[PDB]
Amino acid sequence: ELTSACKKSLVRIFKICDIDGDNLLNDYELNLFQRRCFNTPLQPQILDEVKAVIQKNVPDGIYNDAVTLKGFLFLHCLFIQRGRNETTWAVLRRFGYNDQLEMCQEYLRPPLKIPPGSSTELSHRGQQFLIAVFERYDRDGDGALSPEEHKMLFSTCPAAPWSYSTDIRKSCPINETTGWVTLHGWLCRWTLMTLIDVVKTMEYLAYLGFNVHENDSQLAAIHVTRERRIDLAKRQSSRSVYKCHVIGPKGSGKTGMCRGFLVEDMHKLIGKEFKTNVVNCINSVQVYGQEKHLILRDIDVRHALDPLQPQEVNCDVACLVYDSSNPRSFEYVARIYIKYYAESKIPVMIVGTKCDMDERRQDYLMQPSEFCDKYKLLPPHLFSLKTNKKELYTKLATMAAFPH
Ligand SMILES: Nc1nc2c(ncn2[C@@H]2O[C@H](COP(=O)(O)OP(=O)(O)O)[C@@H](O)[C@H]2O)c(=O)[nH]1
Ligand SMILES: N[C@@H](CCO)C(=O)O
Ligand SMILES: [Mg+2]
Ligand SMILES: [Mg+2]
Numbered sequence: 001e002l003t004s005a006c007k008k009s010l011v012r013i014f015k016i017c018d019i020d021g022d023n024l025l026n027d028y029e030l031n032l033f034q035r036r037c038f039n040t041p042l043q044p045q046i047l048d049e050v051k052a053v054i055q056k057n058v059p060d061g062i063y064n065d066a067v068t069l070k071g072f073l074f075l076h077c078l079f080i081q082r083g084r085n086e087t088t089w090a091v092l093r094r095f096g097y098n099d100q101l102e103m104c105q106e107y108l109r110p111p112l113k114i115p116p117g118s119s120t121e122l123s124h125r126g127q128q129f130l131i132a133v134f135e136r137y138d139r140d141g142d143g144a145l146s147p148e149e150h151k152m153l154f155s156t157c158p159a160a161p162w163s164y165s166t167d168i169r170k171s172c173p174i175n176e177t178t179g180w181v182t183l184h185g186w187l188c189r190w191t192l193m194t195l196i197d198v199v200k201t202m203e204y205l206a207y208l209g210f211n212v213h214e215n216d217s218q219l220a221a222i223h224v225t226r227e228r229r230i231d232l233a234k235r236q237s238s239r240s241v242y243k244c245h246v247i248g249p250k251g252s253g254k255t256g257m258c259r260g261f262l263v264e265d266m267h268k269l270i271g272k273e274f275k276t277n278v279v280n281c282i283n284s285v286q287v288y289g290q291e292k293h294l295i296l297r298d299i300d301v302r303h304a305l306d307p308l309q310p311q312e313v314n315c316d317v318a319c320l321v322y323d324s325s326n327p328r329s330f331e332y333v334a335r336i337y338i339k340y341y342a343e344s345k346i347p348v349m350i351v352g353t354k355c356d357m358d359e360r361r362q363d364y365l366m367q368p369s370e371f372c373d374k375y376k377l378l379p380p381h382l383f384s385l386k387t388n389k390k391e392l393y394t395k396l397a398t399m400a401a402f403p404h
């Protein structure tokens with residue numbers, strides 16, 4: 001008595017409207033999403049009639065003066081078999097369904113003219129939404145999303161935007177004990193996606209129901225930033241998300257360097273092997289007060305003469321890495337710099353890893369010390385995972401946020 005494709009569309013709407021995450025449609029949200037769908041307040045008497053019909057026709061359809069899912073599914077079923085499908089359709093089309101009961105294309109991905117070089121970030125409304133969503137599906141209240149709670153959150157989506165086991169836990173700040181995604185790591189992962197894939201982050205906000213909750217296009221969730229000259233506008237379009245590429249020889253200890261951004265104690269990453277290749281790592285640092293998100297993409301270099309794609313070169317700040325305890329290491333950094341970054345406008349910081357080990361001579365012509373002196377570069381930064389200091393990451397973010 002109710003089509004299967006309609007049940008799937010009604011089971012999503014219920015979850016989106018379940019703002020308390022108690023599997024019930026309480027009095028408040030029902031009246032709220034009545035204005036969202038019909039731009040009129042829900043009359044107090046009609047709600048009683050609804051809750052009277054549901055309770056008498058459906059077993060446990062009304063729980064604690066609130067509508068359950070089976071009560072919600074029955075009501076719209078009752079609407080259709082009484083010649084009132086336009087009431088259900090108004091709800092269905094508000095949550096972005098067409099006549100084929102599938103998500104509308106213009107509803108999922110609205111047109112966004114994004115200038116070349118301009119970055120895309122989460123607006124305040126976008127962050128406020130994603131925080132609210134995090135709270136709803138964090139049932140245990142540990143301030144983290146378990147793999148169970150994560151799947152339940154993206155049960156209203158055709159699929160998760162990322163894996164849980166091989167992505168969000170291995171690329172974002174997680175809880176040390178439970179090993180689960182905290183609110184911070186949750187916001188970090190969305191920040192990453194928003195920057196590198198806008199049409200995807202908006203697509204998923206629609207499934208989650210940002211367009212219904214915020215009562216606006218998901219364009220209101222997206223903030224387009226751009227580094228400009230001195231402007232006297234009222235809207236501060238200052239960036240807050242910077243992408244940092246980490247280049248250098250293989251085994252120079254930069255893969256573990258990126259992963260150390262996420263953990264408090266980086267010392268455990270020494271003997272640990274990385275059985276899952278992660279492209280980008282993201283975390284938040286403080287740069288002169290303002291919160292700043294930095295992305296660390298590690299790019300290994302096999303052969304010295306092997307070319308680098310412009311997608312690998314172009315970034316906000318290049319972190320050239322050499323193994324300080326290796327004589328044959330620095331040679332790669334020299335080549336990469338002179339070829340791609342010497343005549344560039346991208347800030348670049350040379351980092352010598354494994355400074356806990358004995359700093360050796362370099363079999364190159366120039367040593368890292370005077371190599372920077374020749375090209376007016378800041379002196380090489382000695383990095384170690386045993387030191388456990390986040391000073392390097394904050395400088396990387398600082399170099400991206402400021403000249404030169
Ligand atoms: N002593 C020391 N060894 C390190 C450090 N970082 C990485 N390593 C070593 O580097 C090896 C892993 O290399 P990896 O980071 O995967 O190479 P990469 O992907 O080119 O950066 C491990 O066996 C560690 O012993 C460090 O800060 N200190
Ligand atoms: N569809 C609900 C309101 C929105 O959840 C009703 O009319 O009962
Ligand atoms: Mg939890
Ligand atoms: Mg590597």
Ligand code: NA
Nearest residue numbers: 018019020024
């Ligand atoms: Na609710």
